[PDB]
Amino acid sequence: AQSVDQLIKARGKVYFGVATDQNRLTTGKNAAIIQADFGMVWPENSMKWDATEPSQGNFNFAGADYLVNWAQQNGKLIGGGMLVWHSQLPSWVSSITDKNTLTNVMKNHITTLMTRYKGKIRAWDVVGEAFNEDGSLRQTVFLNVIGEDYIPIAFQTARAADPNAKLYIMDYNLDSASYPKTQAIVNRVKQWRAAGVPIDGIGSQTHLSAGQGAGVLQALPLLASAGTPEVSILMLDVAGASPTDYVNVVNACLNVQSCVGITVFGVADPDSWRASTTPLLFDGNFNPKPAYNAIVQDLQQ
Amino acid sequence: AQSVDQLIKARGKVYFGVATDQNRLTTGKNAAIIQADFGMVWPENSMKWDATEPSQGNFNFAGADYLVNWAQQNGKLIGGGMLVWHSQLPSWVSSITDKNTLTNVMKNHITTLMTRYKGKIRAWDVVGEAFNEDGSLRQTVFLNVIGEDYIPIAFQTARAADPNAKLYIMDYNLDSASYPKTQAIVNRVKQWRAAGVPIDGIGSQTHLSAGQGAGVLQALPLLASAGTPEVSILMLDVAGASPTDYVNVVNACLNVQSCVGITVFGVADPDSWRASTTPLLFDGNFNPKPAYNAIVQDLQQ
Ligand SMILES: O=[N+]([O-])c1ccc2nn[nH]c2c1
Ligand SMILES: O=[N+]([O-])c1ccc2nn[nH]c2c1
């Protein structure tokens, strides 16, 4: 089956990517499909905070190491995250109330992960899901204890740890241009970058319902108006996996000069976090679905 | 769907189990099927040596902790392994040439894992795949460096770490009573048990091709002739998933008084290590397959 990564590279983009991990690569047909058809891998779970630092200073890198090794042996790009995120956050972190302690705990978590893989990771999602739906900053432990400068500190710490990685902020429900969360993140990123914060990218965690593809054609250009060097579409899946929805998201990428690529959130439907909505590009028999073929067609023209 | 675990408990057995791990329980329909239909879980990868001790004395428990917690919350039995195995073995272990050092490394690995989950684990696979196909002992780093006492030492150490747990040796290609490996593990286990080695169980890692189920009716009673308190069928899958092959394996279990239960190597076909042979009991849409219903009927007759 024709490679969507090759085709999107031929249209001037960097990658078509997919989330995976060790036990995906040793089961099913996932390794063969990724080798043939995708240009970048992301860790489905193995770089999250509760997988990598379940207790203070007790780092667990076996899973992440496997993925990074596999990607290098097979000539794929590699992304990483979530470095700073309130979900799947171990209790030992959320129980901290001292500002200096939490600051150093955050800095050490960022520095340790990025150092280990220094120079091998194209992009890191440094901070994720930092905004409320009304556009105010989400009141996580980091905001409550450190304050609003936790985002500047995180990005400056990450830039120091690996200056070769592109540093992203990411969030979800950025899929419509009239939604308050979309314009808020644009405005805050503008202001942070004007003050010298090294935010290289905005990543849009794109979990869509049927029919919401079309809206990304006007949301993604808006996200790009923040002036970051890059934007990306991340963790993509679409309930029903209609070709129309998937083609609209791909075309939004193509229409936006700074959008470097697209990452789908898994290979085959039965391995999706919402498998009953069959929202991915390959079915339970690892056959390409009509949406995969529609994307190929769209990219060929 | 009717629960094969409830039905096999009704026939006087302990469990019908499945291998799983954290990212299976958060994707597909695996958690719901396990909750409804299976009585025991085993770690697909999270307790192997490369996952738990990737550098000497530095242990990684995030993935294993998740599985143990989930099982306790949902009222399921838990198994564990492999403690001593030549595959998925970090290179820091396989490069040790000193007998004392390797003995202590092996004992520390066993003792640390078993102590952490002391009293919570029904059975541990202490030693796996220790035999060659001709019935001689496999020349692994443990055999080359420590000698054949490594198996006695492993079991003695395991018994002291958690006396509640059932201790197993396991291997594959024990599916034919006339195959030399089958008689060889019987010979050795009888000798070890006569020397007081605490081997509670032989686990048969049952990876079958079409038509091989019938032979297990003779092989499993032969394995039981070693006199261990228990035997089990583990990591079960069958190319083609013929009802006749699966029912023959279940009936071998039922016929052998010391056989405590059966564990299948995953829930749904696309998540198998040999998915193209569709060898499991649920298909790529998470529907029970003919073999599942045939097992249900067999357990009710
Ligand atoms: O795009 N992605 O599928 C993806 C998956 C996991 C991640 N963790 N951090 N960023 C991620 C992106
Ligand atoms: O029964 N099993 O499927 C199973 C899976 C993994 C294991 N590791 N040790 N024993 C195991 C059994």
Curated annotation (Swiss-Prot), chains A, B:
The active site is at residues 129, 235. Its EC number is 3.2.1.8. One of its GO terms (molecular function) is endo-1,4-beta-xylanase activity. Keywords: Carbohydrate metabolism, Disulfide bond, Glycosidase, Hydrolase, Polysaccharide degradation, Pyrrolidone carboxylic acid, Signal, Xylan degradation. It catalyses: Endohydrolysis of (1->4)-beta-D-xylosidic linkages in xylans. It is an enzyme of class 3 (hydrolase). InterPro entries: GH10 (IPR044846), GH10_AS (IPR031158), GH10_dom (IPR001000), Glycoside_hydrolase_SF (IPR017853). It comes from the Eukaryota. It holds the Pfam family Glyco_hydro_10. Disulfide bonds join 253-259. GO terms for biological process: xylan catabolic process. Belongs to the glycosyl hydrolase 10 (cellulase F) family. This is Endo-1,4-beta-xylanase. It comes from Thermoascus aurantiacus.
